[PDB]
């Protein structure tokens, strides 16, 4: 099967699962996992942090996040588009009783602080508490402006306000920038990381920031229902992620920039290539057709006008260039 | 002294207080106030709806509506600038677990339906579940155009959603169309209508709709603590309103337009004026010193860049046209 | 028409209505209402307390009380028949994502405290974060003991916890302690008071604290929905009320003290009589019988094998006397 | 190393480990792990509801089953001491905007039904709208009488109430009653299993009910931040553990019972022993000494003054044998 629909559809290697069999384990609700303590304070240590806290998902590594950040009554400036706000069914509001504040995010996945500031609220008992600025750093692959990250981050500071990045697809960031991990969690007062999307694990996310935070964190965590036990097993494959699955992120890269050109040349039109995603605008008279033909033909790809292929460690360049002919064969 | 800040600072006329002194009590909360069930009943019959309820505040009105509307989980479409999301705390998503969903109104002060049906949530578990449309006729003075409210109506019945308008100020707007109440309500589930504004009730607001959606709306309001004892007094006030400070709406309008024409006159820059408000582009330089300069003259305006003049029953031509000389001798 | 259902239902006098008419009123969302201010200040300052806030209802008094003390994830510890636990829907936890903790009381209507020790949760990630002791005087007419009232106070100052009292009759309390307000209020960090009842207003209460927790009160008051505008009209019957209403709850006492007697000589079973309450053992038998009797009587009483008799400025001894005759020719 | 903290701490035995690492897996967020699938298919069957859902944790299991039965005002009569009132934060309050109404449990287990019936709330706007109500089977060991199981089912079917039974220890109750799970399943609209427990699993438990039930069920896990991506991995212990481990639970029975005759002839107040536990009367005096001596030779408790201990495959007899003899010399 040639799956092209998300990164998250990776499965565990032959060594990742021989980490997972062997790595030691306790009851992580009692401490006990050395394996996910382990897991913790190599990525906060990674990062330039004082401590992390492991999760089932990255939803819930953002629902914590948030619930840590905002109390009941306050706001987070967050995109229109974002996971955080929009594909988490709403939780913070829902759930932690937190008010969202969406804008439109500018064409290179950037949140404009001009506009950001405009939606500050004064202190008027008609406003909900403005209190935290949530980022998303490879937003639907695009690669925020290292710069940017900078100005947020003073920004904050001189507004008093927190900054959260979900880093779901940080490492794609990391590897573009071509610099060290730290030197941009370093414009964050917290961040996240998805283990089980590009780095291949299959299941798992970090919560990473200071001490006290990360404290009212596993509070959270734990009422959110995400403190599971003997879960070193699975924060092995996390770890063995950290160190040995970063780097080959490039070779993602590479083929997606591969796979447009294929595609351009190839009468597709093709929208942007950002990291590891591309975008085609399939139109609405074909989304599902070219849907079908694909999974005809062991091809999986989500149908719709503009369709996003993903590319991660279980599609190589021979897998895609297969459904450039197919795609080709498609339009003919 | 001349309040223009807002149109929430009309006072009780004599003759309103009198039918307020006059008015038979009953205890509310049993059902035996017959004045509360009066205006209620009066309202709802005016509007061609089942029931209404009369409700402390607009704020409490629509806290209650959004309640009555949208489960845990639901969502709305509303305004950027509406003050059902945004001058209202966020006590929807806060204290009522609903997720909002704000858009920026057109113009014309409408939500524009293309932009709505972009906003509509699939139906996944990502998403909320998207599941009414506020709108607020007479927007920042804004009158929504008729044919919109027709558009607007039949876009959430072929696509199954409850579609609620909040009229703060509908009257403003109804004595603009030159029509019933019935012609613009007939176009929506429920809508609120405040007799504490423009209409110069000293408290009060009503929410309207079915009977079946009225009587939640009476266990959401008990629990948000509006529901009163013998406030038929109260609702006294507001048949005296509804019955005889409609028609001079109209009064407000005009001295509204004429003080715009006077403020130009004085070199003023009128950005617009829209039935009883018009906003002046004052400057962050003035800003602060023009509030203070017309307080000083006895003149309350909410001072600010953009500065917002609301007229009303308890503000005279004669008192207007003072602030025209006053706003031209401040800019000296 | 003798309404004994309860003491919500009494009416305001003429000398009330001519000060209501009377009062100078403002804005109270802008602070501009010298009657609500008045009310406010002359509240706090009897009870020795900061600030006060005047309120549409007590439930929402209560709900904005527990708001303003118990942050998302907190808890507070109440009786199981009391009135902001059983009373007010669980608005606490379903608005304000509250934990409640409820015990039962002891008869004297106060809550052991050895039992609410033992609810006290340990700082532990499982548990939610006890914070507050509610207790309720004048629970259901019952005075608690003033000693209790101070037990309670230096109980909660020991083991660091909030301390409010539920006051809709703390004035039926004051006067049958026979002391000053400030006698028993400064054994609490926040107490409420209703003037509809006993006191005799048509609306209203009062949530009196410290200055700061009062200013978060008010913020939760405005997303509530009880910001009213020029609610000085019903803030006026409050100082009337506390002015001129309070010593003569010594009557409703004396009334129910002769009521329960008549009642025991004409073979009643009076279970309990405090301060303007008293209940009669009538059975599953006769509840709608005698109901119905005293309908036609003009007499309204709650129906239920347990009828509660609730005295007031609006029952004179008189009637009383109509009354016990009847349920006597009931019981022939 | 001993540990007899809780059957939390069991670890995978290398069969299981076998089992988790040849396992096939997909994307459980698109429904494509045949695991998970498989897991669910089988719980279903095995207990005669229609469906079955995969979460992180047992006390995910019970926040999502409810938020799964529970909207927005209702409410749920529970146990003072059950885990899903007392043990989860109260994230039934904090998060689903439920208010609970726990009651004590007899001293068998059970929560009378007759107290029961006095907490259901009459339909009125005062009290929050009563909708489930909650057991836990095998509720700190003790299990539930079968007779008291069909009793609760036939009242709440009476009552029109749902009924759900938490069963994160629902197979050792299975064992000790002899009979098959859908014997005492049929009792119950849903109910939850947890395999990290007494069954010997890393991490996981099910929740388990009608079809529409667990769709809503889906919708909660995702929010909540459950919906894992290949969790086939960790499902697949699930199916050995229930498969393998369920039959040997009388085993811990056993040695549980014979540990509490050891430690009796060793001097120690043995107070009581079901199941899988036992518990000490240590008191607070010898707590924090006990539990130091017992690590200093490798035996883990949780010191108090009241030890509970419990049994699992990770403890076996000769090793129990060890415990009591460091007891009896601890006690000399
Ligand atoms: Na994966
Ligand atoms: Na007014
Ligand atoms: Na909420
Ligand atoms: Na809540
Ligand atoms: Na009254
Ligand atoms: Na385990």
Redesign the interface.
């Known amino acids: 099967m040639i799956d092209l629909?998300?990164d998250?559809?990776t499965?565990?290697s032959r060594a990742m699962?021989e980490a997972?069999?062997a790595a030691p384990?306790?009851?992580d609700?009692?401490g006990?996992d050395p394996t996910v303590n382990a897991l913790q304070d190599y990525a906060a240590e990674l990062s330039g942090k004082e401590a992390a806290i492991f999760?089932?998902?990255g939803?819930?590594?953002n629902?914590?996040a948030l619930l840590s950040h905002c109390?009941?009554?306050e706001?987070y400036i967050v995109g229109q588009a974002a996971h955080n706000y929009?594909?988490?069914?709403?939780?913070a509001?829902?759930?932690?009783?937190?008010?969202?504040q969406?804008i439109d995010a500018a064409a290179d996945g950037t949140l404009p602080l001009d506009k950001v500031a405009m939606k500050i609220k004064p202190d008027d008992?008609?406003?909900?508490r403005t209190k935290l600025l949530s980022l998303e750093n490879t937003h639907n692959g695009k690669v925020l402006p290292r710069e940017y990250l900078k100005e947020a981050w003073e920004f904050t500071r001189k507004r008093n306000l927190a900054l959260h990045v979900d880093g779901a697809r940080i490492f794609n960031a990391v590897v573009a920038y071509g610099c060290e991990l730290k030197e941009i969690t370093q414009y964050c007062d917290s961040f996240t990381i998805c283990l089980?999307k590009g780095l291949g694990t299959?299941?798992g996310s970090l919560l990473v920031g200071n001490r006290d935070y990360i404290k009212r964190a596993?509070?959270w965590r734990?009422?959110?229902?995400?403190?599971?036990?003997?879960?070193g097993?699975?924060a092995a494959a996390g770890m063995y992620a950290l160190k040995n699955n970063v780097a080959r992120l490039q070779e993602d890269h590479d083929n997606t920039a591969w796979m447009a050109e294929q595609l351009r040349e190839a009468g597709a039109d093709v929208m942007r290539q950002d990291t590891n995603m591309l975008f085609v605008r399939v139109g609405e008279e074909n989304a599902a057709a070219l849907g079908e033909y694909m999974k005809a033909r062991n091809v999986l790809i989500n149908a719709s006008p503009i369709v996003r292929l993903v590319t991660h460690l279980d599609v190589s360049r021979a897998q895609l260039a297969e459904v450039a002919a197919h795609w080709r064969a498609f339009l003919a």
């Not at 008992?125 to 909900?128: N, S, T, V």
């Open positions: 629909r998300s998250t559809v499965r565990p699962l997972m069999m384990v306790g009851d609700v009692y006990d999760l089932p998902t939803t819930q590594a629902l914590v109390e009941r009554g706001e929009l594909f988490e069914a709403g939780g509001a829902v759930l932690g009783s937190i008010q969202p969406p008992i008609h406003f909900a089980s299959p299941v596993i509070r734990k009422m959110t229902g995400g403190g599971m036990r003997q879960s097993i699975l």
